[PDB]
Task: inverse folding
C-alpha cells in the first residue's frame, strides 16, 4: 500500500531520447492517477481502451511507464495505427492498444539558448519497428549498394539527428514530454490499484 | 563553462602536520537549497582515483575522520588534520552544478 | 561486490568509430547516474559525459560536443559510448563511475559523487 513512484516519471529533470525511450515498470503500489488528472499542464490526455475515472477503481498486474521528449507537432504519432519517423523508427504503439498517452509542452527546461544536443530521433532504418520495440544501435544506414564501413558519406548516413529545441522556436517545433501508460493483465495477482 | 583554480599549485608535506588546500571558482555555487556542490577527489598515482568529500563538507563514506572541508561562496578549503605516509598523490575539486562538469588542474602532494 | 567492467580499447586509425561498453554488477542499476570520465596520458582528469537515472543524458564536454554519443540500458545493466570523428587528441584512459545519492532520498535529483571506479581501458589513435 505504498504510493506508486509516478512523480519520478513525470517530474524527472531528464527524460530519454525518443529513439532510446525509457521504460519504468510499476508494481506493488496504489496509484492515485487522479493526482495527474487534476493538473492542467498535462493537457494532452489522449487515452484509448479505458476511461481514467473508471480505472481508478480497477487493478492490473503490471503497469509500464515509457517516457521520452518529442517535437510539438509530432505528438499525434504517439497513437495506435500512425506512421512517420517517430512511429516507424522510434516508438510504435500496437494496433490493439489499451492504455493512455499524456503529453505536455516543456518549453522552460527542454529548450536551450545555444540549441540542445541532448536529444536524438532515429531518421533512417531498414524496417519499421514492432510494438514497444527499442533500437539504440547507431550503425550507418546503407541506402546505396556500397558498404559504409562505419563512416558517413554518399548513401551512407549516421541515423540519429539532433533536435535544435530553442526558446524562440515555433510551437510545432517547441519541445514536448510524453508519458505512455500500458496496463497488462495476466495470471499473476493484480498489484496496482486505486 | 566554469573555470576553477587551486592553490598552492604544489606543496611538500611532512608526516605529522596539517595541510590546507584552496579551490576557487568563477560563479558562486550556492544553489537554491543552500548547498555548495563542490566535491573533493584524490587520484592516487598508479591507482584509480577515489572520492574524499561530497556536498561541500559532508564527509564521504569509508574515509577516516582526519579530513576536514570548509568554505562557501567562491572559496573552499580542505585541511588534513594529521598527514601520514599514505596521503601522497593528486587532489582535484569538481563542480556539480552548471553542466558540463569541470576538474581543477590538480594539487600534487608529496613528502 | 560492486563491479564496473569496461571494454572496447584498441588502436584505431583517425577518422573511424569505436563503441566502449561499461557493465555494472552488484547494485540496482536504475538508481544511480553513471558518468564517463577520460584521463589523458600523464595529465589531469577531464569529464566527458554522463547519464541520469531515467536514461536522460546530461550534456557532454565543451571540446568534445558534436561526435560522442552516450546510451544506456537498464535491462542488461549496460552503459555504452559510441565515438565518432576520432582524432589523435582523443587518446586516454576512460573510467565509468557511479553516483552516490539514490534518487528521491534527499531539492532536485542528485548527480555528484563519482565514488566507485572501474579500471579504465587504453584507447589510442595513430597512423
Ligand atoms: C509532480 O509535481 C507536481 C507539482 O509540484 C505535483 O503536483 C505532482 O504531485 C508531482 N507528481 C507528478 C504527478 O508528477
Result:
Amino acid at each position: 500500500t505504498n504510493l506508486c513512484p509516478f512523480d519520478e516519471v513525470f517530474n524527472a529533470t531528464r527524460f530519454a531520447s525518443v529513439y532510446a525511450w525509457n521504460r519504468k515498470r510499476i508494481s506493488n503500489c496504489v496509484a492515485d492517477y487522479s493526482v495527474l488528472y487534476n493538473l492542467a499542464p498535462f493537457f494532452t490526455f489522449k487515452c484509448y481502451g479505458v476511461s481514467p475515472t473508471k480505472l481508478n477503481d480497477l487493478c492490473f498486474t503490471n503497469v509500464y511507464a515509457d517516457s521520452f521528449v518529442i517535437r510539438g507537432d509530432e505528438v499525434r504519432q504517439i497513437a495506435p495505427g500512425q506512421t512517420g519517423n517517430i512511429a516507424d523508427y522510434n516508438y510504435k504503439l500496437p494496433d490493439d492498444f489499451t492504455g493512455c498517452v499524456i503529453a505536455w509542452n516543456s518549453n522552460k527546461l527542454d529548450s536551450k539558448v545555444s540549441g540542445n544536443y541532448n536529444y536524438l530521433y532515429r531518421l533512417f532504418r531498414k524496417s519499421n519497428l514492432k510494438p514497444f520495440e527499442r533500437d539504440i544501435s547507431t550503425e550507418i544506414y546503407q541506402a546505396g549498394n556500397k558498404p559504409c564501413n562505419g563512416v558517413a558519406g554518399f548513401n551512407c548516413y549516421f541515423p540519429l539527428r539532433s533536435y535544435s529545441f530553442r526558446p524562440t522556436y515555433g510551437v510545432g517545433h517547441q519541445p514536448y514530454r510524453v508519458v505512455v501508460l500500458s496496463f497488462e493483465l495476466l495470471h499473476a495477482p493484480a498489484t496496482v490499484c486505486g | 563553462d566554469i573555470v576553477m583554480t587551486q592553490s598552492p599549485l604544489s606543496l611538500p608535506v611532512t608526516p605529522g602536520e596539517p595541510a590546507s588546500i584552496s579551490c576557487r571558482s568563477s560563479q558562486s555555487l550556492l544553489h537554491s537549497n543552500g548547498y555548495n556542490y563542490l566535491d573533493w577527489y584524490l587520484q592516487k598515482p598508479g591507482q584509480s582515483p577515489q572520492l574524499l568529500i561530497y556536498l561541500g563538507s559532508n564527509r564521504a563514506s569509508g574515509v577516516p575522520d582526519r579530513f576536514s572541508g570548509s568554505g562557501s561562496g567562491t572559496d573552499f578549503t580542505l585541511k588534513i588534520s594529521r598527514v601520514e605516509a599514505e596521503d601522497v598523490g593528486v587532489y582535484y575539486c569538481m563542480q556539480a552544478l552548471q553542466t558540463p562538469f569541470t576538474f581543477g588542474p590538480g594539487t600534487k602532494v608529496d613528502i | 561486490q560492486v563491479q564496473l567492467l569496461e571494454s572496447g580499447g584498441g588502436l584505431v586509425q583517425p577518422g573511424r568509430s569505436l563503441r566502449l561498453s561499461c557493465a555494472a554488477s552488484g547494485f540496482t542499476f536504475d538508481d544511480y547516474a553513471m558518468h564517463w570520465v577520460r584521463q589523458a596520458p600523464g595529465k589531469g582528469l577531464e569529464w566527458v559525459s554522463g547519464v541520469s537515472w531515467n536514461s536522460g543524458t546530461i550534456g557532454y564536454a565543451d571540446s568534445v560536443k558534436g561526435r560522442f554519443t552516450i546510451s544506456r540500458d537498464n535491462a542488461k545493466n549496460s552503459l555504452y559510448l559510441h565515438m565518432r570523428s576520432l582524432r589523435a587528441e582523443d587518446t586516454a584512459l576512460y573510467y565509468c563511475a557511479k553516483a552516490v545519492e539514490m534518487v528521491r532520498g534527499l531539492g532536485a535529483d542528485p548527480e555528484y559523487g563519482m565514488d566507485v571506479w572501474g579500471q579504465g581501458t587504453t584507447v589510442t589513435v595513430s597512423s
